[PDB]
Design a protein around this ligand. Structure first.
Ligand SMILES: [Zn+2]
Lengths: 344, 62, 89
RNA sequence: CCCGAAAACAGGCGGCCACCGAGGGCCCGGGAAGAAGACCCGGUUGAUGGGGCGGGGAUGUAAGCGGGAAGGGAAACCGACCCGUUCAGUCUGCCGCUCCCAACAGCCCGAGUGCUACCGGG
RNA sequence: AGCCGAGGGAACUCGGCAAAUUGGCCCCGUAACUUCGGGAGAAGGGGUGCCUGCGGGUGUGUAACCCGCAGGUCGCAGUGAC
RNA sequence: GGGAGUAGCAGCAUAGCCGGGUGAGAAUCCCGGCCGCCGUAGGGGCCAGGGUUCCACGGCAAUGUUCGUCAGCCGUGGGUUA
């Protein structure tokens, strides 16, 4: 008998097409600072830098090559506040409050907007929600946010999302939300340079693939390659049980999956397309523009490593639900070189 | 964060790129591209190629 | 649309159909592409291709038609529906 | 961490319409998506595709013209190759600007009920 | 049914199955054994393009077909494909 | 009857496009041009065998692996001189 591990993981099944291109966040981290727990942007491209190492471990204090991804982040708009209560099993929405003046383009996602809904009505609804929250029934408060893709001329149909707030007092959360609603919100007010983040997006699509590539199955002997079975698995199982088991590798959809990554470091936050290294203001956009993505012009995040998704895809970010015990400092590192040469 | 100089085309290439070749006699060489590496090893003459600096060298040597 | 009379120069991209078909079918597909493209961009109900255009498309055999054609078009309006005629430029 | 309102207690919230018509689909220009279906972006409240003009890139310095060339030939001339014009010429399944051409014109689904016990309020 | 693959080079397999390597011509050089006829194209090594000229053979021939020499020059590669 | 409007109509010679015509009707029939294949055979001549398949006109119910206005198919008339 020969032993070896099975081919592929069963933890990401069923391997099907994602429900939506806009990714959903299932869990939130416990933070003591009262702030919005995430942001959203669009992926632009990749480059590399040379920085002085900070994190614990060998290589500390030396100049190292580091791959980098760039995410364009125009400001979000806060258009609503939601209240949650506790039902029999879990949380259930108690009520919603919206802002009265919304951009003309929001109707491309939300086809049915209210007709008149003036400011005094909005304020009365805010007051009702305030008094409701001021009793003790309510358990959680969340913000309702929409992207503004028209500033960077990428498209006009926004993405609409819900974001949680940190802390442990509903009243503090509500004060924050009431001071935020109806306005534009920037990434520098939410994120801190040097943090660890979790990124969420839908992966690149690859269509239907066979088991060699979908599961890491082996290619058969060359006699079978000449017989007509090279890229096939041997058998679907034994005589008894007299059925095919769900654990047997098979062909199907590959790519376009919901996936989450852990502990990617935020290096720097840029403004208006520039980064400030040593007093200078340099452009991240390489000579000729990013391939399949043009010029960065509003604001951008520099994230260490790689992240799921194609280029113009929507990315969501949250802070470190599962960080290690020896975190690196929350401070922008010392950067000696940023590459902005042609990338095609 | 120093820029290196290629031993075939003579141009500067950026940190984080290229190749260093070592001969068993300690002699070192720097390449910016597989193009230049391959041309060096096959034996194309850069003094004849109008996109190198050895070409201006030879143009003076005329 | 374009006024009948006026001769209009049009650049037809034939590179857009290369790799849609196998190599030995590239020119007979390029002919149909030219026809449909000119019909669309001149809002015509009928297109008449010249022997000169056909011979330019088949010059290098059935595997290597040119990536871009420069063609003069002249439209004649008759019985309503417009009729386009294609020549070389 | 992944799947998950067909979870038969077949859920909650906000908003729109009904009690001609909200909304949706065919159609058109296209991909980041794709075996058919499905998904995403745009359709003159416009840079979606093409063209033109500019950036970046791949090869490696075009044709023509002129001057040399081992040597041969009375002489004129022949002559593989070299030099100059020349980071040239060709191409670009990448980026930006510009309405010059085409995103027109249409066509199809589509919710409306009553009895009993009422509930909570007239 | 076909083309290419970094580093390693039979670790694959009953078994180098299949694929790959060599390859035309001229010169040099050529073992054991042997029925002295062979082995033998043994093995192994060097060269080959284009241009400018100079010579030889038969021939009456500035007709035709063959055999050598020197020099200049280009390419990663000159039986460059077959 | 179900199998099913599914398999097969690929592999050994991957071949059609533009203009004009006929006709109720043309991817498939005719003319011209461009593009291609065979080229010590897919070209030319002619035994055996077959027996009218030869020629012209007129047709398209069936046959031809699809269509067909075409045809070694159907019909009417002809045709082999020592
Ligand atoms: Zn170089």
């Amino acid at each position: 008998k020969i032993h070896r591990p099975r081919r592929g993981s069963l933890a990401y099944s069923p391997r099907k097409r994602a429900k939506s291109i806009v990714p959903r966040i299932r869990s939130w981290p416990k933070d003591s600072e009262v702030r919005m727990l995430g942001f959203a942007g669009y992926k632009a491209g990749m480059t590399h830098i040379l920085m002085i190492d900070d994190s614990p471990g060998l290589t500390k204090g030396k100049e190292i090559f580091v791959p980098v991804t760039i995410v364009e982040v125009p400001p979000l708009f806060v258009y609503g506040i939601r209240a949650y209560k506790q039902g029999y099993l879990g949380l259930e929405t108690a009520t919603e409050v919206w802002f009265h003046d919304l951009h003309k383009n929001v109707a491309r996602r939300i086809k049915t907007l209210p007709k008149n809904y003036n400011e005094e009505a909005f304020q009365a609804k805010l007051g009702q929600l305030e008094d409701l929250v001021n009793d003790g029934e309510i358990a959680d408060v969340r913000l309702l946010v929409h992207t503004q893709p028209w500033l960077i001329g990428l498209k006009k149909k926004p993405e609409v999302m819900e974001y949680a707030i940190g802390g442990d007092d509903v009243k503090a959360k509500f004060d924050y939300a009431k001071e935020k609603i109806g306005k534009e919100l920037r990434a520098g007010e939410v994120l801190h340079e040097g943090e660890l983040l979790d990124v969420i997006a839908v992966t690149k699509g690859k269509g239907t693939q066979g088991p060699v590539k979908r599961w890491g199955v082996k290619v058969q002997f060359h006699k079978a390659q000449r017989a007509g079975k090279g890229r096939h698995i041997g058998n679907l199982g034994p005589w008894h049980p007299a059925r095919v088991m769900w654990t047997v590798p098979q062909a199907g959809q590959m790519g376009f999956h919901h996936r989450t990554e852990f502990n990617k470091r935020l290096i720097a936050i840029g403004e208006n397309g520039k980064l400030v290294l040593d007093g200078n203001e340099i452009e991240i956009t390489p000579k000729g523009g990013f391939p399949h993505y043009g010029i960065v012009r509003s604001d951008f995040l520099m994230i260490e490593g790689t992240i799921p998704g194609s280029f113009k895809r929507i990315i969501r970010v949250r802070p470190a639900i599962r960080p290690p015990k020896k975190k690196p400092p929350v401070e922008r590192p010392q950067i000696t070189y940023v590459s902005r040469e042609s990338k095609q | 964060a120093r820029w290196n100089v290629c031993s075939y085309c003579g141009r500067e290439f950026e940190p984080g790129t290229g190749k260093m070749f070592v001969r068993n006699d300690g002699r070192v060489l720097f390449f910016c591209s597989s193009k230049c590496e391959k041309y060096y090893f096959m034996g194309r003459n850069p003094r004849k190629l109008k996109w190198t600096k050895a070409f201006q060298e030879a143009r003076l040597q005329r | 649309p374009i006024k009948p009379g006026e001769e209009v120069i049009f650049v037809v991209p034939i590179n857009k159909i290369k790799k849609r078909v196998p190599r030995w079918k590239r020119a007979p597909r390029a002919a149909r592409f030219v026809r449909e493209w000119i019909a669309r961009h001149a809002k015509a109900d009928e297109v008449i291709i010249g022997t000169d255009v056909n011979e330019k498309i088949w010059e290098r055999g059935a595997e290597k038609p040119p990536g871009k054609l420069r063609v003069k078009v002249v439209v004649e309006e008759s019985e309503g529906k417009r009729i386009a005629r294609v020549s070389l430029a």
